[PDB]
Each structure stands twice: as structure tokens, then as C-alpha cells.
Amino acid sequence: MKRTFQPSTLKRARVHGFRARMATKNGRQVLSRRRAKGRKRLTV
Amino acid sequence: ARVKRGVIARRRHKKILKLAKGYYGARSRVFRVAKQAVIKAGQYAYRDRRQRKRQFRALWIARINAGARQNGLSYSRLIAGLKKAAIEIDRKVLADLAVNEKAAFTAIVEKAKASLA
Amino acid sequence: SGGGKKPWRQKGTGRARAGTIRSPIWRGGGTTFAAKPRSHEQKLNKKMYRAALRSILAELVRLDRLVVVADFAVDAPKTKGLVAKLDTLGLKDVLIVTDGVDENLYLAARNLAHVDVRDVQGSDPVSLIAYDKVLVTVSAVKKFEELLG
RNA sequence: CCUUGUCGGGUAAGUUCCGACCUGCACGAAUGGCGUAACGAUGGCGGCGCUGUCUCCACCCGAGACUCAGUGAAAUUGAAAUCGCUGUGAAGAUGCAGUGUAUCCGCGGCUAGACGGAAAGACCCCGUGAACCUUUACUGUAGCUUUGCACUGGACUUUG
RNA sequence: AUUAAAAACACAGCACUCUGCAAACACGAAAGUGGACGUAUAGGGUGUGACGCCUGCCCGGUGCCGGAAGGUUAAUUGAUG
């Protein structure tokens, strides 16, 4: 009975990290929406 | 112009819950049960203003009946004298004279044994 | 702000039907008939303003609330000089209606607590039914009859 | 389907089973036909052994239950001073009517009722609701294909 | 996955059909890629489902394959009225 979150700091950064978001246009506007909302982290 | 309704709603709950004073349980202390209970108590209070006039009319008649059969006459023979004689005296004070002034009630039932009709 | 998705599924949850966190029933939600900036300006006919002024001036005469002077001018721009001249008329809480408001008469009496200095054009239904006396000059009743008669 | 067809076997007795018969409602030869060793947490039958499955439960051992100490929930809930019966009644009553019972209050148990609790019935109907699938429904359309004209030329001939 | 582990699916074997290679086919507005750095004993698709004995009749309907060349038929052309 394993669950859906199996943590890995390497897979977290290559899917959701900052370079990954700013590599593509649709994620480069995740980072601007998430900065327009004024969030503390903007890459989690 | 915003208006908050906490001062008017608590004085309106406190009127209906003062009229509920003396009621068992949540009928006297929560509003949804006390509003219904004060409405019901004023439906009954309306109804029983009519029955009070009926319950005393039965009690007068029952004591006049009981005090007439002391003198050898029923209720309906005592009342029957007075489409022929005329005392014009009512059930309220004949019941009060059957109990209290028992000799002045014997004088009325002999005027009704004088009518014979 | 917010309340896009439904808070729970439509059935099965034993909970009353919701469609947003921001319903007007919910304490986060919007006012149901929320205000927007609107105007409360309304239309008087031009004949109807004039007939209502002409009905007010008639009652200012009839109640002795209208006091006509030959001319009304102060020389210095000074409130003390105009208090001292209204006191010669037995007069406080006044409307002063001139034909044209001069500059010293405006600089005096614009601190003074219960007077106004209007011209005839700038007189209005409320401010000559509000002050306990109205001073018009003789030049003002000429201008009131150019407008109303 | 009729149907537990009929006959044989197995049982004391067998709608299942086995072997037959052919009267195949409504088998049939690559939506394969009929067999078939081995295989199977496969379906149905029968036997041996074994037994608390059962006649029919008895005793025993641990963990709860029960009691005391400490901590401390939940679904539910209009309000409750919350009986039986027989009638009545939006047609199956703790509450109406009539009448019998019945001192007041727990605890342990048992679940007949409270049309008990749980999920705005899943069946059924409804809606000029939805979705998804189908096609020889309607209307389209991607794709494939045909020809005209472009890109696109000359040079003889069959040919008009 | 979380009520169905089976007789369902897969399978080896079998057949049918497509495909001559810049292959059929598939993903792509397209370049490109996969098939495949393979080449008909190969690859795709369909159906049956070890093996043994076998797989009858029907080409009307519908599909597919081939066929004359007649009739009907589209844009285009623009005679004549």
C-alpha cells in the first residue's frame, strides 16, 4: 500500500523547478501569474 | 447606508421569550420553540375566552339543579316557570344563592312551584 | 476574489448544495445587489425651478425674513468689519444676496460662522430657506425680476 | 421453451450427474466443427479417509464485555411530562377517541417498533436535461480520390 | 489498483489480405520521425487459437478486385435565344 507521493528532490526540480518553468513559454507565465498574486515562493 | 439588525432582533426575541416565561424546557429558553409556544398559548387564550362563558354556564346550571332537587323540583321544572311567571333572574346569581343564601333560594323555588306550567 | 470551483460534489456528501465559496449566502461572498457608482441628479423643468424660487421669495416677504437694503458693501477684507455692520441691522444667521459678489465682501464673511454671500445666480432653493434672514440689495431685486418676471 | 422429455446407471429416495435416444422452440464446420495426453486457486457430479459441519452442544484457555482509576469520541436531534389495546385518520398512531394497565430512577442484556440512522432512490416515470457509444437517421467534415486552371517546356507524329 | 482471476485476454500454430522501398501503415497544419539503418522466409492489418481428424453448400445483398466502353454526371467553356 504505497501512496501517490514518492518524494525525490531531483525529479521535483526537473519538473517544477525554476529553470524548467522558465525554459518554456507556458511555464514562464506561471512564474509571472504566481508573482502577480504576490507569492512567497513561486517555485515549489 | 448599511444597517445592522442586532439591536432590533434581540429586542424582538426578548418580547416573545418573556411571553414564554414559565414554560417547560426549551419552550421558555430557545426562540424557535418559544415563538411557537407563545402563538399556541394565544390561540388557546382566544378559544378559552369563549369556553369560560360555557364552563361557568354549565357549573351554574349543575348547582341550581342540585339545589332545586333539595326542594323537590328539577332544574328544568324550575326554569320552566318563567315563560309563565317572570323572575328574570339568571343562572349566575341563582347558583350563588343556592350555595350561600339558601333560604332565599327556597323562596324562589316556591314561586316556581306556584307557576305549575 | 476566488470561488471558481464547486466546494464539493453535487451529491453523496450530506451537505447543502453549493456552487462557489463566494455565494451571497456564504460569509465570504458578494453583496447580492452590490452598489456601483450611480447618479442621484434629477430633472427640474427650467420653468419649475423658477416658479419654486418665485414661491420662496413670496414667503420670505410674507414672513418678514427678507430685508432689503439700498446697497451693501464693505471696504476692508475683514470679518470684524462685517460683523460690526450686520450688528447695525440686528442681524445674524444671514444670507447676503448681491448683484455681483465683490472680492472683499467674499473675503470677509467666508470665515464668519453663520453667514453666506451669494449672488442672484448663485442663490438656490435650500440656502435661502435655510438662513434665518436674507439680505438682498436693491440691485438684487432688479436681477430677481430679470430672471423671474 | 415445453421439461424434472424418454430410457439405462448411480441413491433407501437423485430437477443435479453419467451414458444414450433424436421429437436440434433456437448446433454446425477458422464469430471454426468434433475429439484430445498434459495442465488449472476453472464449472458440475460421485467415493475413501477425516472430522463440533451437524444431531446437540458440553467444558476449558487467552482477548473484549462487567467493575474501579485516568483520558475521552461518533452518527442523530422540532420539542418532549416519550404505555397496551381496539377504533379513527394523508388509508399500518407514544401523542386523536374510547378504554385497560401503570410508584420514582438506573444498570446488565435482547433488538419487535419508533414506516430507527446512513446516501435530495440507483428500479420506474418525468424533463422539448446531459453525456458517451452505434448506424443504411439528418447535416456536415478531416483524410483519400477525380478533373479544370497555375507552377509547366519543344519536337515530330496517331489524331480532329 | 478498491466486490468479477474466469470459460474472458494473450499465446505458439494457422489462414486471408495489403505493401517493390521515399513501402503498406502510423504520429505530425509541415519539415520530420517511427516502421527500419529492416526489404516479400520482410513489415503492417484482420480473423482463428497447441495438436489429431477435418473445414460442406451459397457471389443474390453489401464490400473488395478486375473489365470493357455505352448511358447519366462537376467545376470550366460560353453557341444561340
Place this chain on the structure above:
RNA sequence: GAUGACGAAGUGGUUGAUGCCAUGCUUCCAAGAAAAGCUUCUAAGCUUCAGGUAACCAGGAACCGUACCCCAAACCGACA
């Protein structure tokens, strides 16, 4: 109940791996990573000092992680 000083025997025969020889051998088809370090060859180049190869001598090897938990009360499961 801590620490400073002293402190004895320490050999032999058996049985042995799932460890090592072994990335070895034998056999089978389904036919079994790349690239660098490394070894070597020359090119373009060199003054044929630089460069190379041994020897001797002297010095150096930066940065980051390191506690603790892992058949879990420290991870994934709202929970010791």
C-alpha cells in the same frame, strides 16, 4: 565510583562459504552499452632549448556532504 603507571597466554589440527581466483572455463541462442582516462602512431608543427623520459630534492592535493533517523515515532501514509 574515574583515571596515570604495570599487566599474563596469543599455538595446532579439523570444516568451510552465497566471498576470492573469475570480466576464468564449458555450453546455449534470444547473440549480449557507449565514451573517456589509458596504451600507441603520425599530422600541422619545432630551433630541433621548449617538449619527453627516468633519478634525486623540496612542496602541494581546493570546494561541498559528513550530527541523527531508515525491517522508521525523524521517510510515504491528516496520527507516536
Place this chain on the structure above:
RNA sequence: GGGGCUCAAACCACACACCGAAGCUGCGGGUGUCACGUAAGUGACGCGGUAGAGGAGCGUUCUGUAAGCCUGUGAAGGUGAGUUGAGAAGCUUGCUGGAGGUAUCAGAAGUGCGAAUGCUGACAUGAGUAACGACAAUGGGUGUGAAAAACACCCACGCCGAAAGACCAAGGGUUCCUGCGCAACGUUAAUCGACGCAGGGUUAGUCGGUUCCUAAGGCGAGGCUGAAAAGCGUAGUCGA
């Protein structure tokens, strides 16, 4: 309907009484309409009510009247009592409150809640009920302590022992250790703790990474392609 009833408390007639409705009458109460009244004023007929139409109001907050009036000799608010009105509701007052309030008459509305399996918070009931997380197992002594079934040590007894033992990667992030603590957290108590507060603690040429190299795959100068965004990709250069 029950008790119970038999020259009836039954049925059939007739006579006379009586009881019985919010009906009717007596008596006291608004204006609903209408007619009269030079508008005091009495009369007459009404007055159950859902959907619904009409008519009249009360109360709340705000603005004008309001630089007014009230109020620290005590506002709003809260809690009582008394009183008045057909009603919504008003007025007066005791206590609490400790700084505001708004006669009247107009103006504006976030204007009146018990229901929407409403929404938020608080709080009941169930109920001091069920449970307290594997049925390895605990029993004494001593200590400390405000208090020990649970902490420390001691003597026993059980349990695991291809782990309930030792490690590594991952993942976490100080949980490690010591002194002081026990509110909260710990399914009880706790002096104990993975809890609080403060100090300390992690030392590398050789162990792991970086650095070197590549796989899948990603990016990709130019380039090819595509309404745009972009897709694909060569050289390359990332990626254990």
C-alpha cells in the same frame, strides 16, 4: 364511545319542558363603506379568509433641519420593573455601562429572518458511554520527587535474533548530545521524551559528490518547417 340499561336508559307515536354554537339578543368597544351633517355626529348596513388586488402605518441605519437640542449631576449599549396604544411599537425608570446620542418634519436605503439538507462561530444531546492501536509479559527492591504501574539503576522473568540486530542510498531537516524544565504536545500519570528554553556537536588527497566521460533522453548556433506561439534537428553540450 364506556359503565350500564329490560312496564327501559330500546323501538313506535303524541304532548309538554329543558340543555346545547363564536348563531341570535342584551351590554361596553374603530371608522369599513355610504347618505346626511354650513362638516362634531349621528344614523344605516357590513367587518372568516389562501393565491391575489387596494389602502394605511411602525421600527432600524444614513443625510438635511444640526455650529441646534440632550449628555460625564452620566450617552449609546446591556439587563430588569412599571406604564400606554388596534398593532408593529412607544414612554418612564432601578441596576450595569463609561462617551456619545438625535424631539420633529422631510430625504435616501446593504431596512425588519425561524426554516433555503442556508453560511460562519460558539454550544448542547448522544455520554462520562465507545475506545485508549496487535493477545513479547511482567514482577520486586532502591533512588529521585510535591506526588512514581510507566523515569533511572539493581535483581529476576519473558520477547526478537535472515530481526524487534547492525549498516548504506533515498527522503527528512537538528529530530543527535548535555544542563534546566512540564503549561501545551504524548490516546492515562510523568520526575521521562522524537516536547519547551539555552548552550554544544557534523573535521577527509583516499568515504560520497564536484571536477573527467558518456547512455536513455533533454536543449540546441546556424539550418529546415510552421498563422503566431512554435516543431524538428546538425555541429555542439547537458544528462548516471
Place this chain on the structure above:
RNA sequence: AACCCACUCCCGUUGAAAAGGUAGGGGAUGACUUGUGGAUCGGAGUGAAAGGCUAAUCAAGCUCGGAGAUAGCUGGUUCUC
């Protein structure tokens, strides 16, 4: 045996657990089990095929917009005479 599975019983169903446990059971040198990194995604993948699976969600994920969709339906709509 480990390991991976999940046929049967019972318990558990407010659970120790949003799918477990105990006793038995299947595979266990293979079409095996598994770590780490990667590839494919919403009329779209993936599927030894069950409409299965695509983060406890799947006859079309999640999230935010169109958007206060629409609802001839449901429920509710607050002072007095």
C-alpha cells in the same frame, strides 16, 4: 523461502488500515520481480482488452477562465393593521 501476487475463510466495516490482518493459497530462471533516470496527456495518451489506467478522481483528469452557463424544475423569500 525471500520476493512478487491476491484464490478462499473469518475478523475488521465509527476500522490499527479511504481495501488491511490472521490462518491456508498462486508464480517463484522468467512473457519474472525491482531501484534509478527518461519518453508518451485529455476526443489525448496507454491498455496480454476490464471502459481498464492516466497522482485515494476517469464512458473523457485536474485547475483557472467563458461564468452569476442553463434549469418550463426544487427549495427558501424577513415588520404591523
Place this chain on the structure above:
RNA sequence: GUCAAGUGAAGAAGCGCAUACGGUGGAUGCCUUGGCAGUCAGAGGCGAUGAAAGACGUGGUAGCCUGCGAAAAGCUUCGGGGAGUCGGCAAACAGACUUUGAUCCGGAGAUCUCUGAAUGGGGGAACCCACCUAGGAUAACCUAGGUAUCUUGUACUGAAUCCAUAGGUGCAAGAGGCGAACCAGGGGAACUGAAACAUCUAAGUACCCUGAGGAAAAGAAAUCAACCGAGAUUCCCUUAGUAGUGGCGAGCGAACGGGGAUUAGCCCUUAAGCUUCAUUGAUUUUAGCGGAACGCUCUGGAAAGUGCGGCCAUAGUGGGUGAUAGCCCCGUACGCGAAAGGAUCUUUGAAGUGAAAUCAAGUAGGACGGAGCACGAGAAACUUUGUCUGAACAUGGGGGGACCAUCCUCCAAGGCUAAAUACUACUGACUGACCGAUAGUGAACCAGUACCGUGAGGGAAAGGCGAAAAGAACCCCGGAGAGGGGAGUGAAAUAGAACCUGAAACCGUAUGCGUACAAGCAGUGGGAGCCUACUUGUUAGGUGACUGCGUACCUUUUGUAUAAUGGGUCAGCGACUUAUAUUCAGUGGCAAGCUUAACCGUAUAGGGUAGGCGUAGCGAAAGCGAGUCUUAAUAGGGCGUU
């Protein structure tokens, strides 16, 4: 006394009701350092001179905010200010700095680590590894610069290939990124409405994408008009919901002509205009300075309030001071003021640009297929064009809604142009019949936080002591507890920090009465006894033995006690609004007239009568008019009419 019988007051484990206090809880009222919406202005961008957004560091205590950046709550300079200061949560304490002028406030400069377009190369953002040149350093480094790509320009170099093209290399110059809307374009839904749906609608909306600017686009007639004329564009008001258009359904919707806002047209024989500098005066902005006039008295903790008397006023309904202040304080009216920058306007030069070359050819026109014009290809004009074609040349050519003639009016295929207009993330000032902690921003408070998700994303709750901390020395019980009892403090501590008010549900203690042989919506009519206050009793409050009648409420229904729905309860919140058109009623102003819209306005005034409706109808219409139609028929009816 005894025995029989009859009668029954006390004795409540617990419950009910009332009252009195108390707890829980946080309502209400009052409040505000926070929001919300306007009006008037500002300036409309930031960034390779390294932005938005950050990571990490920076302090005597040191966490998090705010500042800063290894020069790190700051360093140098001017200018201002004049007595205190070392930012805030956060009060204290250390060690200090300041009249030889600190802190603070503006202008200018210096520093400015790491990430981020991120730009030397990589990468899992805040990390890793380098190279080149110059200088300095003892087998280790250090300092100051360079090192991205693409575009354009330029120099040098040179493949197949002879020439020179491609390519290579170096230099200059520029670009990239971010931002709430506004703008020009590219691509473009669907639910929905039509009471189904497909044409159509929704709607060229949402959304994605690309550019530009402080505005943008548009714009100087191949434009409209009817034989009269008007002259760019954009914007508002009307024409008018009219003409048209449309499964002629739902719907969509002009123009002519008027009224306004604004006011410029220049050129392709080279121009206005605009950018960059350099200057000429001027005006603003970035901080400040001066800034009038009240005492006594009363109550009180405290006076601004009371009572009396004054004063000031270009300053009187400001903020807060121990209760309500024109004269206490800070302001306000009103005057003044700038070392140094910024910005606007203006002189008068300069380099540019506009600028495409020379009045427009693959263009106008046409045929197919689309799209637009309000116009669903329709008699369809006009405009755009994906495919195919294809002119005339001022004794031309286009338009005037199929088309043809005649008139009228214009010159397409080159351009550039201000103002009126749109918007507000950001500043500032004023304002509100806006909100007042369940409200108003999600956010008054360390909020886009905590928390939930792998992620995009979702997204809270939480204000109030007092005037002043005067925040409770000391004593006592307790575990050097928690929490209390005193004493102090204050006006008040039942203002003691969870702190103003302190409601209701809910939970208690005390007291009075009722209740253990009596059946059910829990009340109501009658009613004894008992108990409290009072005064007379024929009262007032509490309790209510006993008894008559009595099956909650909502919703939904022909009907519900219904065993039909909904509600555990309390407190807050929660549902007929607003805009624009229109009709009817009431109430008003004017009246055969009435009323204005944009806009103007020293601005609720006044102007502005474009328009709208009325005074005349009938007809499909020309038209005729107190009258048409019809038919050869003024012959016969419908509509209107003082």
C-alpha cells in the same frame, strides 16, 4: 386509658418553574492605524549604466519586518532644519554620538555580493567550472577590465570554382526582459437565446499570440450630396430602434441631414512636423519658514463641558490634548522660500529624421472561392483577396447601392501630420446620505501568510487594558507552580494583561413553591394551598395540587398530528436591486404649445430648442386633405373629423 373505624400533615434519590448571583461564550454598542468609490492634478514607464521579482548577508544584545550590500539600519557632498539621537514588532538595558551642530528631511554622487532577460560555459535560480589581456605576488594566488547571441553596419579574410558569392574573423551601434488597463493586428470558441435544432445568435465576445505608444489607430477626399451645396480625421448628442436586414424567426441595426468638442494641413524640384544636442528667458516640481486671538468659575479623576465676561478671523463644523477647544498643541487662511537636480513651455542655431523618389501597373477592373460593409450572395452596389487573369493615360480614370445614358462630384494604386478621444498598476491633494472587524480588499493583526495540493492552483482565522504602565513592591496557601486570598495602583481591577461593553444558547450554586397511584404537543380556562413583599384586600410577585378543552411548526398539496419535506440550539449574516428605454396612475410646472440632449458655463443658475412629442387624418403608395380606395362608375361601406 384500651380497642375498632375513618381521615392524612411533615420525611425528595433526583427533577420542574421563577428569582438572585456566577461561569462559558463572544454578540451588541462605541471605536479605528484598514479598505472602497469618485473628482482634480501629476507622469505615463522600467531594463545590458544588469529591470520586475528575489536568495543570502548586514546590528552590542538578535528572531522576524523595513532599510541597506563585504564601504552592508549605512559612506562623501551641497541645501534645509536646531535638540535631541543609535528604524519597527520592543520596553528596557548596555556602549555611545551630538550647539565645533548629530538623528531627521530633500538634491547630487560613491558603494551595490549572489541569482533573475542573465549575457564567458554549464546548471536542479540564488550554484559549478573557466578562458584572454594588463599589473602585483616565493612551488598557492590576487587586483582591474574583458569573454553571450541575434540584427544592422563596416573592415579584413576567401570554398567547391577561374573570377567572386557563400562562409570565417574582428570592430562599432542596437535589440531581447517586465508591467493592471488602454491601442493596432494575427488566430478564434462554446455554454446560451431561438422556449428542440442545423441557418442565425451568443460574438469577432472570451481566450491565445504579435507589435507599438504615452496615447494608439485614423486622417487632408478617385468623400458625400441633388442640380442647391458641403469639404480631412477622431469623439459626444440626435436622426432612430427608423430605413434596411433576418429559418423576414430569435435577432441585428444604418445613413442623409442637424447640434457640438477640437482646429493645422504640408510634401515626393524634398515640406510642415518630430527627435537629438547646444543655448534664451520663463514657469513648475523635489524640503521647508513665518503664521492671529481665553481668562475666571462650577461639577469632576481629568474641562474643551457649566456659569459669566472678553478676543481674533483672507484663520469657525481639521487633527488630539485626561469629557465636547476658532484663542492649549500641530495645523488652517494667507504670505514667503531652493546649493543642486527633474519636467513643461519658450527663443535660435546645429546634426538628423520625415523620405517613399520624380504623382504611382501586376495596379484598377474581371472570373471562381471566401470575408467585410447594419446587409444570412440576395436585383447586390462599394471595399478587401486565396487561386487565375488583366487596362485607360486629362480630347483619361473612379464613384453617385444591379445596370445603361445624361449630369454632378472627385484623381486610386507614394507618403507624413497636433488637438478634441481611451485607459490607471503607480504618485499626491481633496471628497463621500461608502464600510466599520461575519462588514469593507483574500489581508486593519508579520496575508497571498498559515494550511491544502506532485503541480498549475486553492486559500483562512486572528483588532480594543488605561488618560498615563501608574502592568500589581511586600505578605499568605501551593510543587521557588498553575491559580488564588489580601495589600497597594487607578476615577474604576466584576478595567489584571485571554484585559472596553460583555448579549444569547449552554453549564452551575443558593432560595421559595411544586413533584415518588399517575398516562399523550406540555399550554390554556377554572382553581385550592403554600411562600415572599407590602397594606388592608375585593391587591402585587412566585409556585400551581386538582380539573374542562387541547394530535407542534414550515413547506407542499384535493388533503398532513402525519409514519411526507426541512430545522440540534444560540448569535451574526442571508433573497425583488440598479441602469437605460417605455406604459399607466397619482401629484406638480407650463400650456396650443411643452421640453431640451450633447455641450458652453466665475457650474444644481443661466445659456443651448439640434431633436422628441402635441396641434389632422386617410391610404400600401404617389398623393389628397376635414378626405382617399374601388371599379368604365363623384353610384353603395371602413377609417378620421368642431
